[PDB]
A paper describes a structure:
The study reports two crystal structures of Bmlp3, a protein belonging to the 30-kDa lipoprotein family found in silkworm hemolymph. Members of the 30-kDa lipoprotein family are the most abundant protein fraction in the hemolymph of silkworm fifth instar larvae. The Bmlp3 molecule consists of a helical N-terminal domain (NTD, residues 1–87) and a β-trefoil C-terminal domain (CTD, residues 88–239). The NTD consists of six helices forming a right-handed superhelix and is classified as a VHS domain.
The crystal structure of the second crystal form (Bmlp3-c2) was solved using a model (Bmlp3-p21) with the correct amino acid sequence. There are two protein molecules in the asymmetric unit of the Bmlp3-c2 crystal. The Bmlp3-c2 model contains residues 5–239 in each chain. The dimer present in the Bmlp3-c2 structure is formed through interactions between the CTD domains in a tail-to-tail arrangement. The results of PISA analysis of the Bmlp3-c2 structure suggest that the dimer present in the asymmetric unit could be also stable in solution. The interaction interface between the CTDs of protein molecules A and B is formed mainly by amino acid residues in loops β2–β3 and β6–β7. In molecule A this loop is shifted by about 5 Å compared to the same loop in Bmlp3–p21, whereas in molecule B this shift is about twice as large and the loop is bent. Such an arrangement of loop 106–116 in both protein molecules stabilizes the dimer. The central part of the dimerization interface is occupied by an iodide anion from the crystallization solution. The iodide anion forms hydrogen bonds with three water molecules, with I…O distances ranging from 3.2 to 3.7 Å, and with two nitrogen atoms of the protein backbone (Gly158A/B) with the N…I distances of 3.7 and 3.9 Å.
Numbering used by the authors: 5 to 239
Write the structure that this text describes.
């Protein structure tokens, strides 16, 4: 077996979502001094906007291969799965996501891109994996407020949903899946809601203080991560 065939095999395995055999292959290769194959494969999954890349990483993390995820994937993956604190930064506008600090309701805090704040604890978040139907999904937890990001049931005229924090996860509205992408020299992700299949985005309508409210966008984003995707920073 040449690197081409072995690589194609590993990639094929990831794309068809046969994760036990993809992990078998990886564990083999990392032992046989063939890390460049796994690394090329990651790069190709990530260039091709393949979602399976998340499940593949998580399966390595769960099956005694954290080290492969640490060495052969970009640091973001480790940041996700180690449930380290992160900042979700909207690529298009360069704002960090947060929850409002002043709320007249007892229920949920509205989410938005913070105009002044890239630093304070208010932009700290954590992603929490769960496994269902051969797929990986995430709860998104604001660390200061101990509240989960959700989309609501209501919609505006175009059919976007509001995003805000809620105390717990009892539905698919509070779950999310990631689709990796590349722009410039960095890794980005679109973030879709599990219930409604909409991407989390910031409105083009600016608030006086530079703010932009967060919405579940009803529209097409694939192809333009420099407009609709998020960077994950180590905080």
């Amino acid at each position: 077996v040449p690197n081409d065939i072995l690589e194609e095999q590993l990639y094929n395995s990831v794309v068809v979502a046969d994760y036990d055999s993809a992990v078998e292959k990886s564990k083999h290769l990392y032992e046989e001094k063939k890390s460049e194959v796994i690394t090329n494969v990651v790069n190709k999954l990530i260039r091709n906007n393949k979602m399976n890349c998340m499940e593949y990483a998580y399966q390595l993390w769960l099956q005694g291969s954290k080290d492969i995820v640490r060495d052969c994937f970009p640091v973001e993956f480790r940041l996700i799965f180690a449930e380290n604190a992160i900042k979700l930064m909207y690529k298009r506008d360069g704002l960090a996501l947060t929850l409002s600090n002043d709320v007249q309701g007892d229920d949920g805090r509205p989410a938005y891109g913070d105009g002044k704040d890239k630093t304070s604890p208010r932009v700290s978040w954590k992603l929490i994996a769960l496994w269902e139907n051969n797929k990986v999904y995430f709860k998104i937890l604001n660390t200061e407020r101990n509240q989960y990001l959700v989309l609501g049931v209501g919609t505006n005229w175009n059919g976007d949903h509001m995003a805000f924090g809620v105390n717990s996860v009892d539905s698919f509205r509070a779950q999310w899946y990631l689709q990796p992408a590349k722009y410039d020299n960095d890794v980005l992700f679109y973030i879709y809601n599990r219930e409604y299949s909409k991407a989390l985005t910031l409105s083009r309508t600016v608030e006086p203080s530079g703010h932009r409210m967060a919405w579940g966008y009803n529209g097409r984003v694939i192809g333009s991560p420099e407009h609709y995707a998020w960077g994950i920073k180590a905080f």
